[PDB]
From Swiss-Prot:
Subunit structure: Monomer. Part of the Cascade ribonucleoprotein complex. Interacts directly with the 5' end of crRNA, CasB, CasD and CasE. Binding of target ssRNA or dsDNA causes a conformational change in the Cascade complex; CasA is required for high affinity target DNA binding. Interacts with Cas3 once Cascade has recognized target DNA.
Alphabetic keyword roster: Antiviral defense, Plasmid
Protein name per its UniProtKB record: CRISPR-associated protein CasA/Cse1
One Gene Ontology term from the biological process aspect of the record: defense response to virus
Species whose genome carries this gene: Thermus thermophilus (strain ATCC 27634 / DSM 579 / HB8)
Function noted in UniProt: CRISPR (clustered regularly interspaced short palindromic repeat), is an adaptive immune system that provides protection against mobile genetic elements (viruses, transposable elements and conjugative plasmids). CRISPR clusters contain sequences complementary to antecedent mobile elements and target invading nucleic acids. CRISPR clusters are transcribed and processed into CRISPR RNA (crRNA). A component of Cascade, which participates in CRISPR interference, the third stage of CRISPR immunity. Cascade binds both crRNA and in a sequence-specific manner negatively supercoiled dsDNA target. This leads to the formation of an R-loop in which the crRNA binds the target DNA, displacing the noncomplementary strand. Cas3 is recruited to Cascade, probably via interactions with CasA, nicks target DNA and then unwinds and cleaves the target, leading to DNA degradation and invader neutralization.
Stated family: Belongs to the CRISPR associated protein CasA/Cse1 family. Type I-E/Ecoli subfamily.
Chaperone as UniProt keyword: no
Gene name as annotated: cse1
InterPro entries: CRISPR-assoc_prot_Cse1 (IPR013381)
Pfam families assigned to the protein according to its UniProt record, in alphabetical order: CRISPR_Cse1
NCBIfam families xref list: casA_cse1 (TIGR02547)
Length: 467
């Protein structure tokens, strides 16, 4: 019917320092001409990559082995004919509006009593979305929608979209081709199918949580129908939509290639999550095997490929992006993008031993500073005021904040054993700077002073440990 996502411009890409919008076809067939997918929403960036990856995996029936992807990097593009043959064949499943099979939507959701399209967006008068915006918001909702209250068509309480919670690891090259190659983890198509390879979903199938699937196909999970949606064409835009239950995810053993894991205190594997009291890079030693963690398959694929690129004289110009939501329950507190170098030989025991040391020191000094802040607040004065004064002190905040700036430079040089020492100095520098700010806080009013004397005692004590 209208607006084919393979053809029409809707994926924002950077071409020659300029943002332009392209379809899937151009984004895939001519990937080398774009530096990256360029969008303000890290959630959009994430799903736009996942969709393309889904399409490549199926059109190439692979990559079957690491070697395939290494071969295509050399040629400077991937097999082009099988992309076209695939896009031709499933073309009619890629219209945003369609009387039987609209993309990621439910055809027979009803027009009356619609919800606004703004409901697809994360919750941190109503404008008309362009078709391109409607398409992107749909994609983000289906990947990132948190579980909670639905109370529609017999379900009541909806489940998490598959990628609602975890931080997503996305290696990036210097153009889109390389970035896609760096995320094309070896794949086998058997017993996996993306949403457009399976018959369109209908309201009858979805009422009362009737359609349940194992949460276990890579491309099935990349394109999982987490909610029933039906965008309504206003003429030249979208404001309203039908809205209902999607497919219920049943528990299966499967980890999304972009998801990493770590042991918690009690010794259970959790997914690395973004959070605002804790810098993300503090989980980078925990996600490794030597501490019982699992590293994101994408990061693993890329580091190995970086090895095989170096040994052939090819580049190791690879950055890691982390995308995702910070959230509690049905609420989304924040959306973040974080950038890190992807250092050569990161999964070598020399670099991993250096990494464990560098975080252990940081957590060790940090908990010391945390306890210093605890004693100081007790000297200044129920747990009302003690925890109120706790955060009021800039000691821990400034300390971790300064290491945010310092961690990238350490992390790129992580294969050196001459790095551990520059790091040891960064810690001193960050502690000194944070303590100075706390001395500014304590020397301004005469009653904050019995805290300051004894605080300085323990601060000097702490600096003697590592140095």
């Amino acid at each position: 019917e209208k607006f084919n996502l393979i053809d029409e411009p809707w994926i924002p890409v950077l071409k020659g320092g300029r943002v332009v919008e392209v379809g899937i076809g151009e984004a895939l067939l001519r990937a080398h001409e774009f530096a990256r997918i360029e969008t303000p929403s890290p959630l959009e960036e994430a799903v736009l990559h996942r969709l393309l990856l889904a399409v490549l995996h199926r059109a190439l029936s692979g990559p079957r082995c690491p070697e395939d992807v290494l071969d295509w990097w050399r040629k400077g593009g991937f097999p082009q004919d099988p992309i076209r043959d695939y896009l031709n064949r499933f073309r009619d499943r890629f219209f945003l509006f369609h009387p039987e099979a609209p993309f990621l939507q439910v055809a027979d959701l009803p027009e009356e009593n619609p919800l606004p399209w703004s409901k697809l967006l994360p919750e941190l008068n109503l404008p008309k979305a362009t078709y391109a915006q409607a398409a992107r918001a749909l994609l983000v909702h289906q990947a990132f929608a948190p579980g909670g209250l639905l109370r529609r068509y017999g379900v009541g309480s909806a489940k998490d979209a598959p990628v609602a919670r975890p931080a997503l690891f996305l290696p990036t090259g210097q153009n889109l081709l390389e970035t896609l190659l760096l995320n094309l983890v070896p794949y086998t198509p058997e017993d996996d199918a993306p949403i457009w390879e399976v018959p369109p979903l209908r309201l009858g199938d979805l009422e009362g949580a009737r359609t349940k699937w194992p949460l276990t196909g890579r491309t099935r999970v990349y394109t999982w129908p987490a909610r029933g949606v039906r965008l309504l064409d206003e003429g030249d835009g979208v404001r309203f939509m039908g809205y209902g239950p999607g497919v219920e995810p049943l528990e299966a053993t499967h980890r999304d290639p972009m998801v990493a894991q770590r042991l918690d205190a009690k010794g259970n594997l959790l997914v690395l999550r973004l959070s605002e009291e804790r810098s993300f890079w503090r989980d980078f030693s925990a996600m490794l095997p030597r501490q019982g963690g699992k590293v994101a398959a994408t990061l693993e694929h890329a580091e190995n490929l970086q090895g095989e690129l170096e040994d052939e004289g090819l580049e190791g110009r690879i950055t890691l992006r982390v995308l995702g939501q910070v959230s509690d329950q049905a609420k989304v507190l924040d959306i973040r993008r974080e950038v890190y170098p992807l250092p050569s030989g990161l999964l070598t025991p020399k670099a991993e031993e250096n990494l464990e040391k560098a975080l252990k020191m940081a957590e060790e000094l940090g908990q010391g500073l945390k306890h210093l802040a605890q004693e100081v607040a007790k000297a200044v004065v129920y747990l009302e005021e003690l925890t109120k004064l706790a955060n009021s002190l800039p000691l821990e905040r400034l300390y971790w904040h300064a290491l945010d700036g310092a961690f990238p430079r350490f992390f790129a040089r992580v294969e050196e054993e001459a790095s551990l020492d520059l790091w040891r100095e960064a810690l001193r520098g960050a502690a000194l700077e944070a303590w100075k700010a706390t001395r500014r806080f304590l020397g301004t009013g005469a009653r904050h002073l019995k805290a300051l004397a004894q605080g300085e005692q323990e601060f000097g004590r702490l600096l003697g440990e590592l140095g």
